[PDB]
Amino acid sequence: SDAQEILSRLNSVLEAAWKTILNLASATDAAEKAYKEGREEDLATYLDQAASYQSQVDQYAVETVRLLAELKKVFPDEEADRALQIAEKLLKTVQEASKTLDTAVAAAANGDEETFAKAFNQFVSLGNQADTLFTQLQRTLTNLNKK
Amino acid sequence: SDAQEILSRLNSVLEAAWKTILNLASATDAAEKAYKEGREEDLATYLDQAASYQSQVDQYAVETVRLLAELKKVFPDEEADRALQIAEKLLKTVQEASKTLDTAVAAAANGDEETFAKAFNQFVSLGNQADTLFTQLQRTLTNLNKK
Amino acid sequence: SDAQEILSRLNSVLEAAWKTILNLASATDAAEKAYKEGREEDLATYLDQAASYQSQVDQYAVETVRLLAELKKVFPDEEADRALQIAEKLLKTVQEASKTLDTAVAAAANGDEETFAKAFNQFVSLGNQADTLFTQLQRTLTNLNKK
Numbered sequence: 331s332d333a334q335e336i337l338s339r340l341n342s343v344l345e346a347a348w349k350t351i352l353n354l355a356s357a358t359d360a361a362e363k364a365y366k367e368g369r370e371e372d373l374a375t376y377l378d379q380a381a382s383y384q385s386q387v388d389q390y391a392v393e394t395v396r397l398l399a400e401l402k403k404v405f406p407d408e409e410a411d412r413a414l415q416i417a418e419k420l421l422k423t424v425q426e427a428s429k430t431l432d433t434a435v436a437a438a439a440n441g442d443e444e445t446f447a448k449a450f451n452q453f454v455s456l457g458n459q460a461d462t463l464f465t466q467l468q469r470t471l472t473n474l475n476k477k
Numbered sequence: 478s479d480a481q482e483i484l485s486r487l488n489s490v491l492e493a494a495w496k497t498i499l500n501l502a503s504a505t506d507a508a509e510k511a512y513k514e515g516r517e518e519d520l521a522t523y524l525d526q527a528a529s530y531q532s533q534v535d536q537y538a539v540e541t542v543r544l545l546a547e548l549k550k551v552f553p554d555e556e557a558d559r560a561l562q563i564a565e566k567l568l569k570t571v572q573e574a575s576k577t578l579d580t581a582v583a584a585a586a587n588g589d590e591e592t593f594a595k596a597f598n599q600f601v602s603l604g605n606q607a608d609t610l611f612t613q614l615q616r617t618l619t620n621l622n623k624k
Numbered sequence: 625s626d627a628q629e630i631l632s633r634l635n636s637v638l639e640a641a642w643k644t645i646l647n648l649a650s651a652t653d654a655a656e657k658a659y660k661e662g663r664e665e666d667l668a669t670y671l672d673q674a675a676s677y678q679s680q681v682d683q684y685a686v687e688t689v690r691l692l693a694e695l696k697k698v699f700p701d702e703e704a705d706r707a708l709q710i711a712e713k714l715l716k717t718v719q720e721a722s723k724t725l726d727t728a729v730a731a732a733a734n735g736d737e738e739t740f741a742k743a744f745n746q747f748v749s750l751g752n753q754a755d756t757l758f759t760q761l762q763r764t765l766t767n768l769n770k771k
């Protein structure tokens with residue numbers, strides 16, 4: 331059916347997103363280490379890398395919202411309705427993480443440790459919020475792949 | 478002169494290689510964390526990322542040898558001889574790191590932890606040896622770029 | 625089921641690997657022609673292409689082992705054991721080819737043809753050994769799939 335193609339694309343998107351999230355986590359940890367070690371050029375590179383993966387996560391979140399809305403049209407189900415609401419909250423949260431990472435990038439560029447520390451801490455907290463949303467989404471998708 | 482262009486290309490290669498090495502370091506640290514935490518699927522992702530960066534380092538290390546070989550050909554004396562010798566030892570070490578990382582990746586996929594740990598720890602040690610040569614090469618090239 | 629997902633991903637990986645293997649074979653033949661003709665810059669280009677394709681084959685071979693390892697966990701039988709054993713031997717052989725190509729690429733960059741030619745011919749032999757295992761694995765997966 332159409333529903334099966336959409337679910338297959340969703341599965342591929344969430345698989346790719348999970349890899350990107352791992353890359354984002356690695357870059358973020360490397361930025362934390364460079365920050366603690368006072369290696370400003372390393373920190374700049376790793377913030378740029380984190381931002382790149384963050385932008386990709388943002389795009390996977392967009393694509394997930396789009397695909398779930400498509401699924402609701404061709405295969406109505408309160409579970410797909412549920413996944414879409416989670417996916418939309420995830421999209422809001424990753425965008426908020428991007429904004430805070432951008433603040434951290436600008437603060438590092440300006441050499442403004444006080445703004446940097448607040449922004450970087452908020453980024454980490456938003457990442458955790460989003461990871462919690464991502465896991466709910468994965469389990470809703472599993473409950474959808476078995477219907 | 479041909480020499481100016483070559484030294485220029487070399488500085489660009491080494492700057493790109495340094496970025497890649499930072500990515501390889503972040504992925505290696507993330508693999509170590511996944512390994513400690515027993516998160517096998519995460520470890521697989523990070524090992525694949527490390528292998529991809531390591532392949533890119535290998536390519537840059539090849540290009541560096543080729544460029545220094547070319548620079549030596551536009552020299553009537555043994556001036557670039559030492560830079561080339563360093564770069565060839567760097568390449569040898571980088572390729573040993575690559576082989577050893579491959580052994581680690583296979584051992585992880587095979588679920589052979591004894592082999593994995595031995596190879597992963599060897600890879601880390603080869604990376605530090607390679608880093609010593611990389612920095613030595615950069616210093617030698619500064620002493621050539623003055624003209 | 626999980627089984628059918630794994631088997632479909634495996635079929636896709638092996639189809640992609642087969643194309644990469646064809647690309648590797650063509651680059652290897654082009655490198656041999658450039659070597660015989662004495663065109664060192666062409667040889668460098670083709671060796672770099674070969675190395676890139678080889679790194680991709682290495683990754684697909686790792687993915688194939690991981691997928692068959694997963695399948696054996698879900699159905700612990702002899703056919704799953706057989707397929708995994710073949711895939712692990714394929715991976716070993718591919719990594720041996722990869723290390724041998726590394727030796728050849730470095731020798732060509734170092735201007736050491738005696739080492740290059742020996743290693744290049746070793747690489748070709750290992751590639752043909754890997755092809756034997758690759759076709760054996762395809763035959764084993766027919767017994768695992770159509771079922």
Ligand SMILES: CNCc1ccc(-c2cc3cc(F)cc(C(N)=O)c3o2)cc1
Nearest residue numbers: 351355358387424427454457460461464
């Ligand atoms: C601070 N320790 C490293 C770290 C950093 C970020 C995250 C993380 C997970 C995650 C899951 C998502 F679905 C979205 C994001 C995001 N930042 O958009 C995530 O970040 C996890 C660990």
Ligand SMILES: CNCc1ccc(-c2cc3cc(F)cc(C(N)=O)c3o2)cc1
Nearest residue numbers: 498502505534571574601604607608611
């Ligand atoms: C284990 N802590 C992370 C880590 C990993 C690798 C390296 C490293 C540096 C380096 C420099 C080179 F010139 C080549 C390589 C390489 N592996 O080819 C390097 O690895 C540094 C830190």
Ligand SMILES: CNCc1ccc(-c2cc3cc(F)cc(C(N)=O)c3o2)cc1
Nearest residue numbers: 645649652681718721751752754755758
């Ligand atoms: C074109 N005449 C040279 C030649 C012949 C065969 C190959 C070859 C086949 C093959 C199959 C695999 F499954 C893996 C590899 C590899 N090198 O990893 C292969 O290489 C490479 C070069």
